Amino acid sequence: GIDKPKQYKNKDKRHPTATNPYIRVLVKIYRFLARRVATPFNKAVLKRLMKSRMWRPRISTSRIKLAMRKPDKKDHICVCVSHVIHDDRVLGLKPLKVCALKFSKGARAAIESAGGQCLTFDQLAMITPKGSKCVLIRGKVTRRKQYKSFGAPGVPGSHAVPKLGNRKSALRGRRHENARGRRKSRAFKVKA
Amino acid sequence: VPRKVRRLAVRAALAASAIPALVMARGHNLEDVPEIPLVVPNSVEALEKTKDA
Amino acid sequence: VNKVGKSGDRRKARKSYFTAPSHVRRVIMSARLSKDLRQKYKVKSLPIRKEDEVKVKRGSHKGRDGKVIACYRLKYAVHIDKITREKANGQTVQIGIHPSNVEITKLKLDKDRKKLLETKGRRK
Amino acid sequence: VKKGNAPVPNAHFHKHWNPTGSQKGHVRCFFKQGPQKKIRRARRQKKAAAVFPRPV
Amino acid sequence: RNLPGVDINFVSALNLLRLAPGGHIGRLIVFTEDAFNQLDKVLKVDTIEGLPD
Amino acid sequence: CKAQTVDKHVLWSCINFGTSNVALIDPYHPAHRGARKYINQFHSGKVPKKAKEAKAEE
Amino acid sequence: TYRERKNKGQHQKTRKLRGHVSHGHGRVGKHRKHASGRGNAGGQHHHRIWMDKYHPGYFGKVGIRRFHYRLNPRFCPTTSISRLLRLVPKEQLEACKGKEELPVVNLLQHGYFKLLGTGRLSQGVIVKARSFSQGAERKIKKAGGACILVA
Amino acid sequence: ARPLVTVQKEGKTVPLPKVFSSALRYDVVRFVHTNIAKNTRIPYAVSRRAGH
Amino acid sequence: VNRTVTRKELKKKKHVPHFKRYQSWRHVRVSESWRKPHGIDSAFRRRFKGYPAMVGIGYKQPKNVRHVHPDGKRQFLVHNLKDLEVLLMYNKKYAAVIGHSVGARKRKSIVTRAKELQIKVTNANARL
RNA sequence: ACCUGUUGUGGUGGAUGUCUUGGCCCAGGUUCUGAGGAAGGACACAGCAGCCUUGCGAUACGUUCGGUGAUACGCAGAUCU
RNA sequence: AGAGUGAUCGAAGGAUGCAAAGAACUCCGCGAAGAGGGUUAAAAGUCCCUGAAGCCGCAACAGGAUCGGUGGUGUGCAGUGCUGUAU
RNA sequence: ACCAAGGAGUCUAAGGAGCUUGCCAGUCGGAUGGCUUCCAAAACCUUGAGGCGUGGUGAAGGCAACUAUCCUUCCAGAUGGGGCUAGUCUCUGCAUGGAACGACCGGACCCGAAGUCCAGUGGACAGGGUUUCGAGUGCUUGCAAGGUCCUUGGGACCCGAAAGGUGG
RNA sequence: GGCAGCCAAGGCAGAGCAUCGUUGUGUAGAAAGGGCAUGGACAACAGCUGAUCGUGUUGGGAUUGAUCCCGGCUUGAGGCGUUGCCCA
């Protein structure tokens, strides 16, 4: 026997959990690209195609606009390995090249009403095989209604949303879980 | 099942019906089948006999 | 819902077959007509009856012929002119034959029998 | 009660809702919905045929 | 109707239990001409999808 | 009827997971070699009988 | 693939625990029915820590109680100024840009009663609604339009 | 420029509908079929007082 | 490959012992089929010195010879002439084991066609 | 001879496999008992009948009449075309 | 059916055969059986589709003092299969 | 004692956290409505209120997220651009974590209520400060279905009290 | 994981193929690690079956194992199996 160190297990994810055969085709294409072009962009896109669906979150035309707002990205292609949905709050879009896994009808209309293009990842692989002039943006995994509840509300400093199953009080003063440990009146309030 | 997903299932089943390397895979004899998908003149909608069918 | 009477339930159909009365076993024990009779009367099948001739057409007595002498509707059997069999002792007994095997060679032609032939013969 | 963070149960099934051997139960299963749809349609058109030359 | 394996269906209501029986895909369909012409109108398909190769 | 130029991965996913035929979906069945090359010929359009038949060119 | 080849099982863990005597619940501490209470039992005695840690504001009574709480007279869906110009056919938004006429936005048509004043406004519009914030009023008035109280 | 589909028994060539260029999603098909096949099931249950 | 496994490599299998369920020899209710012991005091499970062998993966055999029979050939359960025609190209790797229910009439045709194709039928002489 | 074992065989035993005039379940319809005597309970009633029968009541395994149309049957016995 | 004074409790229990063709006749015996001889595709013999395990009888063969055991191990010796097999 | 057959984590309402699929500021809508021998109580359809989400905060009276070219700031940081060079500089800055806010929304304080204004009963906001709180916002992270492991109510993994009650 | 020097092989992208390296105890417990097996629905095997199903019994072979296949006999159908998936 031997006093072992930890036997290596690779943390990284190397198989698409997606059940869509066309997502699997894209994983095949970008395995090829991350091997025989070997750019950081191609390796990143391969990672993100592997990612489960929680971790390739939806992203808005507002995020596309915020990414491309700088004059440096006049010809760049905004790449999101995600479903792209439209921010109704965004009114005037610039002509933008945007590659994604899916564009909502609204996002596609908003991007093609400004003269932009809605690219699929195979089109991106044939246009920029090295992913040059491609602005990768992800999408935010906080702000989830689960992430807000993560932790404990009764822990001082943790501002976790208490788990309320289906009970949405109508009187916000006589709400559920708002009295003892929520006001110093009731002998203590959870610290901030 | 959401209606969108059921309609997508119908669409995909039709596409696979159009691809013939799956009709034979499911086990149909495409020996005498001229084309896939198979289209037929509307005169058969006025068929009255199983012999003519 | 399927309408009443036209049900393909195995259990119900078998119950009916095994609890039918004699007036229903009369029509369950129908036999096919010969081609002579079939052309002559334009009728294809009738309930078998005592006193008419049959050809066996099936079973270990196929190709034999004779007049029906007993419809044993309780057993769904039919006894024939001379299809007999000796017992352990010399006593000759009759062999029951399901009338689906036999075809009909002649009829007795009572009044109701002729009326039945006519009513089924008029094509509609 | 959970050893976790799940919400407070608030289950509301304390009063013999279950059709067991001892109880009749408080359960109504709507298996008639399918057949009753067609039956309602049939009686509606029978209403039409009854009061025919008038709005249904 | 009486022909043993044959099933009947209409473009107005396409049954997936008939387009993919057993869950298996690639069944022989023998659309008539107007059914064929109305397929994408009924299913409300406007475009062809850009699928990777 | 060039309905779709389907990828090999997608075609074979459909065959493996939506047909229920041992000689095709079992990679280690002593009919899968012949069946795989046969279905590849069938998808290419012509399968031999080495004269090659014409088979539903889709 | 190979993973997809495994569309198997219906009660995977239960059927896997067959052959193992304690059925995944231990030999020392058995799986015994209700060893801690039924429901929320003990919220102040032996589940005191759990209730304190995962549900602070439990166990109390706060606020004015309102007998016969009507909610229809309190129903008031709100929108924002950022989501206004989406509600104007951009033909109007174009033919009214620099000119004096302003398109009319009837929020009740879309199901909003109050108008909240978050989001910038590009050109003045006339907004009919049942209530407005003073921020929304300020932004609309500065953009050029007007707020209108409508039943 | 859609492909042409001939009509058997009658010399005629229609176009090919855009349905048949859609995604061959066997997985969606299998899911939806195994969940629609459940919609014709009819309840079964033992007697209520059975065994008591 | 249409290659029969040689005796050279058949004799290099790794001597799987005759595994049994523990105490399957005390009682007729305890069957012979293996079961992993889950007892707390079990000397078998604790692997005492002179106790029988414990089923494990070290006894598993290489892929080249695993499921290969003393014939040197793998087996294929056939019921039709279709399955023979399937094994047509692998008459040296595989041997056509007819199914136990296949009657004499189809066994005759299977044996005929398989001896034209020169595929070995492990149960050629079954019924006449 | 006795014991232990392994086969073959014969017993004891009724597991298995296959089925089912049975159950259970869902849907639809009806709910139609009684002082003019109900539901139930007795005692009777068959050539050979004890039981059973949602058979029957001293007209007692049945009476009138209709539909059907040659059987019924475990034996016999005269009616029946 | 059965149990309890009673209120009540309450079982076990399916399958011959295509057809009763339900085992004629002979010997022996008081008789049942049995030995023949029959029906039948077959006794499938009114215990009747099949007939498992446990247990038992018999014959053959192999051993028989010893927890020196059941079981494992590596050979051996007898009996018994299986696979392959050069010129 | 022996053998055989039976024999114990199940379904349901609500929910949690992953995973899959579809759609997207929407999503779902099988209460119901349109159709068509059995199959079919299926399938199909968008007549659909409404559920959840888009805003939170206050006990309540109530109030309701600044920013006119664009853009909250800082530290680390995924990509990518332009120079450059096997020394190696600038621009971009996603996700995540931490900090901040001269920011803002609602509540609570303190000094005030100066100032502007009018759908004018004197009312509406407004200023500057705080060791302030929120399950707040800072380019809406949603909905539905399925699946896995679970939770609580249910017989509740299976068997098991001495007991309590109602009527005979 | 075809855009390969050629054949042979592999050819299902969480698969497969080639090389190399590491590491192998385990109660409770776990595995979005992999499989064997039972009843039935939806499908496929133009699957098998009176030239004898299934059960059972006895030998043989395969398997690390759950278990699988076959020969003999019983037995004779009031039949059975293999694969995918779903309901238990």
Side-chain angles (χ1 to χ4, degrees):
Chain A
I2 175 163
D3 179 350
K4 295 183 287 184
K6 167 189 306 190
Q7 190 185 18
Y8 183 63
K9 279 155 288 279
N10 200 326
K11 284 175 175 169
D12 310 333
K13 199 181 160 186
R14 288 177 174 183
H15 50 85
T17 49
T19 318
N20 192 358
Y22 301 91
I23 301 289
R24 298 207 299 252
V25 171
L26 295 183
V27 170
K28 196 170 171 324
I29 301 160
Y30 271 83
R31 265 163 193 164
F32 190 90
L33 293 186
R35 291 293 293 269
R36 274 171 83 172
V37 168
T39 53
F41 175 85
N42 288 115
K43 278 166 283 184
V45 176
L46 187 47
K47 262 179 281 186
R48 297 177 194 207
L49 294 163
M50 299 324 200
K51 296 291 148 279
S52 58
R53 189 175 183 176
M54 174 202 173
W55 290 108
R56 38 187 176 87
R58 322 168 310 133
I59 198 161
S60 48
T61 53
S62 64
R63 292 300 193 199
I64 319 298
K65 186 194 82 50
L66 266 191
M68 308 282 288
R69 80 179 185 291
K70 294 304 187 67
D72 298 332
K73 313 171 170 58
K74 55 96 181 176
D75 50 349
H76 292 41
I77 305 102
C78 183
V79 181
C80 319
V81 196
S82 295
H83 206 131
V84 171
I85 58 142
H86 178 38
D87 194 16
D88 263 16
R89 297 192 318 243
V90 166
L91 265 294
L93 259 185
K94 289 191 199 158
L96 292 174
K97 313 185 189 190
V98 185
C99 186
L101 286 183
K102 271 152 194 284
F103 289 82
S104 72
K105 297 185 312 294
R108 169 181 299 283
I111 297 160
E112 301 217 322
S113 174
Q117 264 197 26
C118 297
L119 304 179
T120 59
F121 273 102
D122 59 51
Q123 299 179 320
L124 175 75
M126 280 175 289
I127 285 171
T128 69
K130 321 166 65 64
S132 278
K133 300 178 185 170
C134 297
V135 189
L136 264 177
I137 65 174
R138 294 195 222 245
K140 175 177 306 299
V141 192
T142 64
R143 297 311 323 259
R144 283 172 82 243
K145 61 158 155 55
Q146 282 93 339
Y147 169 90
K148 298 178 181 172
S149 296
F150 288 169
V155 163
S158 177
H159 297 264
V161 162
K163 297 217 200 165
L164 301 174
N166 48 356
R167 321 183 64 175
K168 311 166 43 193
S169 295
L171 266 167
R172 204 196 165 270
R174 308 185 54 89
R175 222 204 297 105
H176 300 92
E177 287 90 2
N178 84 326
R180 186 249 181 199
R182 286 295 202 209
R183 328 169 68 76
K184 291 183 299 296
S185 166
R186 273 70 197 169
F188 91 96
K189 182 205 188 308
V190 171
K191 200 72 65 58
Chain B
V1 195
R3 311 173 204 158
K4 266 142 180 158
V5 194
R6 308 199 288 255
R7 289 191 289 251
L8 201 151
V10 163
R11 267 172 280 156
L14 282 181
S17 175
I19 280 188
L22 310 175
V23 180
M24 73 88 62
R26 191 191 169 278
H28 299 274
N29 218 21
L30 309 194
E31 294 276 327
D32 304 353
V33 171
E35 267 206 356
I36 289 291
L38 267 169
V39 184
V40 158
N42 291 315
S43 182
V44 304
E45 290 185 356
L47 274 183
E48 302 280 3
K49 307 305 280 298
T50 300
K51 69 185 301 193
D52 302 338
Chain C
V1 181
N2 180 18
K3 74 182 287 188
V4 53
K6 293 182 312 191
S7 171
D9 192 341
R10 173 170 181 84
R11 184 185 163 178
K12 299 183 189 170
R14 183 181 284 269
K15 174 73 166 291
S16 299
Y17 179 84
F18 287 133
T19 55
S22 72
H23 78 275
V24 185
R25 283 160 187 250
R26 177 188 151 279
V27 77
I28 288 183
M29 295 167 47
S30 66
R32 190 195 191 84
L33 264 52
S34 177
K35 288 194 177 65
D36 277 6
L37 275 60
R38 197 180 186 184
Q39 177 272 352
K40 179 183 182 317
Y41 298 112
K42 303 178 296 296
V43 63
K44 172 185 191 161
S45 307
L46 275 72
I48 211 169
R49 189 192 198 277
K50 187 177 53 191
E51 299 291 325
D52 58 28
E53 282 82 340
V54 293
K55 189 174 198 60
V56 184
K57 290 279 303 163
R58 271 312 172 278
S60 160
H61 297 278
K62 50 193 312 179
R64 280 185 66 131
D65 62 334
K67 187 196 69 90
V68 178
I69 68 174
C71 289
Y72 207 114
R73 299 182 191 165
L74 193 64
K75 295 172 174 189
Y76 285 105
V78 160
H79 301 173
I80 307 192
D81 196 341
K82 61 184 181 294
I83 300 196
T84 51
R85 187 186 190 282
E86 285 150 26
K87 215 190 285 186
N89 38 1
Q91 175 176 357
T92 47
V93 309
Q94 285 292 338
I95 297 94
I97 291 180
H98 194 266
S100 67
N101 305 340
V102 299
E103 87 172 357
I104 304 183
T105 299
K106 279 179 49 188
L107 264 62
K108 185 179 185 293
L109 296 189
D110 289 330
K111 166 180 272 192
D112 280 359
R113 173 56 66 90
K114 295 189 313 171
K115 201 170 176 176
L116 171 71
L117 283 183
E118 279 206 6
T119 305
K120 301 177 71 86
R122 48 193 59 160
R123 274 83 61 198
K124 219 192 275 207
Chain D
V1 307
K2 196 266 178 184
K3 317 177 68 167
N5 205 354
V8 168
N10 167 71
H12 270 90
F13 285 95
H14 286 78
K15 47 166 71 173
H16 294 189
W17 67 278
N18 187 73
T20 190
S22 46
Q23 301 302 327
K24 296 260 207 63
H26 303 343
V27 166
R28 194 181 309 285
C29 298
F30 292 110
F31 299 133
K32 66 183 179 66
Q33 177 185 5
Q36 285 296 325
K37 191 181 173 188
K38 291 184 47 173
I39 289 172
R40 269 194 312 272
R41 206 181 158 222
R43 74 175 50 155
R44 212 178 295 128
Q45 84 171 337
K46 210 163 185 301
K47 157 184 216 190
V51 52
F52 155 56
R54 304 188 185 76
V56 191
Chain E
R1 208 198 288 152
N2 206 41
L3 291 173
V6 192
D7 308 278
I8 301 279
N9 216 355
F10 319 110
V11 290
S12 44
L14 272 171
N15 197 353
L16 184 79
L17 304 191
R18 302 293 193 261
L19 301 173
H24 309 144
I25 219 164
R27 197 195 171 172
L28 196 147
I29 318 183
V30 63
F31 297 100
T32 80
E33 176 185 357
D34 283 331
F36 203 58
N37 295 344
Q38 297 165 11
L39 269 175
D40 58 356
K41 177 65 175 66
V42 167
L43 292 167
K44 310 198 78 61
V45 173
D46 292 330
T47 53
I48 67 183
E49 325 175 350
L51 299 159
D53 189 39
Chain F
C1 296
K2 56 184 181 295
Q4 192 167 341
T5 177
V6 67
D7 194 7
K8 196 193 79 76
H9 186 106
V10 166
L11 175 83
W12 266 109
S13 296
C14 305
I15 299 176
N16 294 152
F17 307 133
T19 45
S20 156
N21 179 242
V22 69
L24 273 159
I25 74 180
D26 201 343
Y28 312 122
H29 190 266
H32 185 251
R33 286 195 50 72
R36 184 210 285 110
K37 76 158 310 178
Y38 189 99
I39 199 53
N40 292 138
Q41 289 161 328
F42 208 92
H43 193 38
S44 59
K46 309 196 78 189
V47 76
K49 174 57 198 67
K50 274 76 71 176
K52 291 178 72 70
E53 296 288 327
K55 294 280 99 173
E57 300 291 328
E58 289 90 7
Chain G
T1 325
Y2 188 42
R3 166 85 184 245
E4 290 287 86
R5 196 71 275 168
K6 214 211 190 187
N7 202 353
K8 317 186 317 190
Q10 180 151 28
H11 275 276
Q12 54 157 55
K13 195 185 173 184
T14 293
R15 307 301 308 192
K16 189 147 180 185
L17 285 181
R18 282 306 167 73
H20 323 269
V21 301
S22 317
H23 198 277
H25 289 280
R27 305 185 174 270
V28 166
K30 272 72 72 175
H31 181 199
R32 297 201 151 146
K33 37 183 54 175
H34 308 104
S36 56
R38 277 202 192 207
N40 316 312
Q44 294 185 7
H45 318 291
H46 63 293
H47 302 145
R48 154 75 69 99
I49 302 190
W50 179 81
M51 202 71 82
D52 285 15
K53 188 164 171 168
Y54 303 99
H55 310 286
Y58 215 79
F59 294 142
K61 193 208 303 174
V62 171
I64 276 162
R65 68 201 205 271
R66 286 267 152 94
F67 308 142
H68 197 49
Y69 203 53
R70 284 102 47 90
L71 285 160
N72 288 7
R74 292 184 31 89
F75 187 76
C76 175
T78 58
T79 190
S80 312
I81 287 172
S82 63
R83 285 171 64 80
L84 285 173
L85 312 183
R86 71 180 179 92
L87 299 166
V88 177
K90 196 203 181 203
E91 54 95 14
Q92 286 169 334
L93 217 59
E94 279 214 59
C96 299
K97 174 59 175 63
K99 278 71 53 185
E100 178 188 0
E101 258 165 359
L102 321 167
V104 169
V105 196
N106 190 20
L107 291 176
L108 268 71
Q109 179 195 359
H110 315 277
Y112 311 114
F113 292 179
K114 195 173 193 169
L115 182 90
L116 297 180
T118 169
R120 286 89 64 102
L121 199 57
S122 315
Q123 60 216 64
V125 298
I126 309 164
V127 181
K128 301 181 299 191
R130 290 188 164 171
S131 179
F132 313 80
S133 296
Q134 66 163 333
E137 179 216 3
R138 200 189 304 113
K139 294 184 169 166
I140 284 181
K141 189 174 285 294
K142 199 190 179 186
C147 300
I148 294 181
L149 270 302
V150 165
Chain H
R2 283 293 275 171
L4 284 152
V5 193
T6 178
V7 173
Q8 304 311 315
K9 279 204 160 222
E10 185 68 27
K12 291 177 73 67
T13 67
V14 296
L16 193 148
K18 306 172 169 192
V19 183
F20 306 107
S21 298
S22 60
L24 275 83
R25 301 218 34 192
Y26 66 94
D27 52 309
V28 166
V29 166
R30 174 199 289 176
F31 169 78
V32 173
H33 174 276
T34 66
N35 283 275
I36 291 175
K38 301 192 189 156
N39 292 2
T40 58
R41 305 180 73 195
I42 289 169
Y44 62 86
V46 301
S47 194
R48 179 182 60 97
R49 286 274 282 165
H52 277 297
Chain I
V1 293
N2 194 30
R3 180 201 59 97
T4 314
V5 158
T6 82
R7 283 284 266 168
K8 278 269 179 52
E9 51 189 353
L10 284 178
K11 82 168 157 53
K12 311 305 220 174
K13 281 195 159 152
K14 65 157 69 163
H15 182 273
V16 190
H18 180 78
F19 293 113
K20 278 182 291 187
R21 202 192 313 194
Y22 192 63
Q23 276 178 347
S24 73
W25 44 91
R26 294 251 303 252
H27 312 288
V28 195
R29 56 177 184 263
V30 192
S31 168
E32 285 86 351
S33 83
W34 166 260
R35 297 284 176 267
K36 190 175 59 168
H38 285 113
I40 54 178
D41 303 334
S42 179
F44 187 42
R45 204 257 316 158
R46 296 204 255 153
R47 308 296 295 129
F48 277 12
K49 183 181 81 101
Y51 276 63
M54 185 69 75
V55 159
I57 207 73
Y59 294 98
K60 168 163 171 157
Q61 282 167 347
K63 47 163 297 289
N64 72 340
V65 80
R66 180 175 150 93
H67 295 293
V68 175
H69 296 259
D71 298 330
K73 304 183 187 187
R74 290 178 175 87
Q75 286 185 353
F76 183 54
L77 204 55
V78 307
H79 310 268
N80 301 111
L81 299 171
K82 290 286 302 298
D83 291 331
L84 288 177
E85 300 290 332
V86 156
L87 276 197
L88 198 148
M89 210 54 58
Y90 309 105
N91 48 350
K92 294 181 177 58
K93 179 187 285 304
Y94 292 104
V97 180
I98 312 178
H100 69 294
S101 65
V102 193
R105 194 200 48 241
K106 279 184 78 74
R107 269 172 197 272
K108 178 54 195 189
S109 299
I110 286 184
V111 162
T112 295
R113 184 84 192 105
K115 82 183 298 293
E116 280 106 12
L117 287 190
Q118 309 176 24
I119 319 160
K120 170 156 175 290
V121 178
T122 64
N123 55 4
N125 296 145
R127 308 167 202 182
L128 293 171

Coordinates of all heavy atoms in Angstrom, one line a residue, chain A residues 5 13 15 19 27 39 49 63 67 72 76 102-103 108 134 146 155 158 161-162 169-170 173:
Chain A
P5 N -1.8 10.4 -2.5 CA -2.5 11.7 -2.7 C -3.8 11.5 -3.5 O -4.1 10.4 -3.8 CB -1.5 12.5 -3.6 CG -0.8 11.4 -4.3 CD -0.7 10.2 -3.4
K13 N -16.3 19.6 -17.4 CA -17.4 18.8 -18.0 C -17.0 18.6 -19.5 O -16.8 19.6 -20.2 CB -18.7 19.5 -17.9 CG -19.9 18.6 -18.0 CD -21.2 19.4 -17.8 CE -22.3 18.8 -18.5 NZ -23.5 19.6 -18.4
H15 N -18.9 16.2 -21.7 CA -20.0 15.6 -22.4 C -21.2 16.4 -22.4 O -21.6 16.9 -21.3 CB -20.3 14.2 -21.8 CG -20.5 14.2 -20.3 ND1 -21.7 14.5 -19.8 CD2 -19.7 14.0 -19.3 CE1 -21.6 14.5 -18.5 NE2 -20.4 14.2 -18.2
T19 N -29.9 16.8 -24.7 CA -30.6 15.7 -25.4 C -30.9 16.1 -26.9 O -31.3 15.2 -27.6 CB -31.8 15.3 -24.7 OG1 -31.6 15.2 -23.3 CG2 -32.3 13.9 -25.1
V27 N -21.6 20.3 -30.7 CA -20.5 19.9 -29.9 C -19.5 19.1 -30.7 O -18.3 19.2 -30.4 CB -21.1 19.0 -28.7 CG1 -19.9 18.3 -28.0 CG2 -21.9 19.8 -27.8
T39 N -8.1 27.5 -30.5 CA -8.1 28.9 -30.0 C -8.8 28.9 -28.7 O -9.7 28.1 -28.4 CB -8.8 29.8 -31.0 OG1 -10.1 29.3 -31.3 CG2 -8.0 30.0 -32.3
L49 N -21.0 24.7 -24.8 CA -22.0 23.7 -25.4 C -22.1 22.5 -24.5 O -23.2 21.9 -24.5 CB -21.5 23.3 -26.8 CG -21.5 24.4 -27.9 CD1 -20.7 24.0 -29.0 CD2 -22.9 24.7 -28.3
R63 N -28.5 43.0 -23.4 CA -27.2 42.6 -23.1 C -26.3 42.6 -24.4 O -25.2 43.0 -24.3 CB -27.1 41.2 -22.5 CG -27.7 41.1 -21.1 CD -26.9 42.0 -20.2 NE -27.3 41.7 -18.8 CZ -27.0 42.6 -17.8 NH1 -26.5 43.8 -18.0 NH2 -27.4 42.3 -16.5
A67 N -23.1 44.9 -24.7 CA -21.8 44.4 -25.1 C -21.2 45.2 -26.3 O -20.0 45.6 -26.3 CB -21.9 42.9 -25.5
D72 N -15.5 50.0 -30.7 CA -14.5 49.0 -31.1 C -15.2 47.9 -31.8 O -14.5 47.3 -32.7 CB -13.8 48.5 -29.8 CG -13.0 49.6 -29.1 OD1 -12.6 50.6 -29.8 OD2 -12.8 49.5 -27.9
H76 N -17.6 43.2 -35.1 CA -17.6 42.0 -34.2 C -18.9 41.3 -34.3 O -20.0 41.8 -34.6 CB -17.2 42.3 -32.8 CG -15.8 42.8 -32.7 ND1 -15.2 43.7 -33.6 CD2 -14.9 42.6 -31.7 CE1 -14.0 43.9 -33.2 NE2 -13.8 43.3 -32.0
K102 N -30.5 29.8 -30.2 CA -31.9 30.1 -30.6 C -32.1 31.6 -30.4 O -31.7 32.1 -29.3 CB -32.9 29.3 -29.7 CG -33.2 27.9 -30.3 CD -33.6 27.0 -29.1 CE -33.6 25.5 -29.6 NZ -34.9 25.2 -30.3
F103 N -32.8 32.2 -31.3 CA -33.4 33.5 -31.2 C -34.9 33.5 -31.1 O -35.5 32.9 -31.9 CB -33.0 34.4 -32.4 CG -31.5 34.7 -32.4 CD1 -30.6 33.9 -32.9 CD2 -31.1 36.0 -32.0 CE1 -29.3 34.2 -33.0 CE2 -29.7 36.3 -32.0 CZ -28.8 35.4 -32.5
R108 N -35.2 38.0 -32.7 CA -34.9 37.9 -34.2 C -35.4 39.1 -34.9 O -34.8 39.7 -35.8 CB -35.4 36.6 -34.8 CG -35.3 36.5 -36.3 CD -35.9 35.2 -36.8 NE -35.1 34.1 -36.3 CZ -34.0 33.7 -36.8 NH1 -33.4 34.4 -37.8 NH2 -33.4 32.6 -36.3
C134 N -15.1 38.0 -32.1 CA -16.3 37.5 -31.5 C -16.3 37.9 -30.1 O -15.4 37.5 -29.3 CB -16.3 35.9 -31.7 SG -16.4 35.4 -33.4
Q146 N -34.2 30.5 -7.3 CA -33.5 29.6 -6.5 C -32.3 30.2 -5.8 O -32.1 30.0 -4.6 CB -33.1 28.3 -7.3 CG -34.3 27.4 -7.6 CD -34.9 27.7 -8.9 OE1 -34.8 28.8 -9.4 NE2 -35.6 26.7 -9.4
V155 N -29.7 33.2 9.4 CA -28.3 33.4 9.6 C -28.0 34.9 9.4 O -28.4 35.4 8.4 CB -27.5 32.6 8.6 CG1 -26.1 33.1 8.5 CG2 -27.5 31.1 9.0
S158 N -26.8 36.9 6.0 CA -27.4 36.2 4.8 C -28.8 36.8 4.5 O -29.7 36.6 5.4 CB -27.4 34.7 4.9 OG -28.0 34.1 3.8
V161 N -34.0 35.0 0.6 CA -35.5 35.0 0.5 C -36.0 33.7 1.2 O -35.6 32.6 0.7 CB -35.9 35.1 -1.0 CG1 -37.4 34.7 -1.1 CG2 -35.7 36.5 -1.5
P162 N -36.8 33.9 2.2 CA -37.4 32.7 2.8 C -38.2 31.8 1.8 O -38.8 32.4 0.9 CB -38.3 33.2 3.9 CG -38.5 34.6 3.5 CD -37.2 35.1 2.9
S169 N -49.1 36.1 0.9 CA -50.0 36.9 1.6 C -50.5 38.1 0.9 O -49.8 38.7 0.0 CB -49.4 37.4 2.9 OG -49.0 36.3 3.8
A170 N -51.8 38.5 1.1 CA -52.3 39.7 0.5 C -52.1 40.9 1.4 O -51.8 42.0 0.9 CB -53.8 39.5 0.3
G173 N -48.5 43.4 5.8 CA -48.1 43.6 7.1 C -48.3 42.3 7.9 O -47.4 42.0 8.8

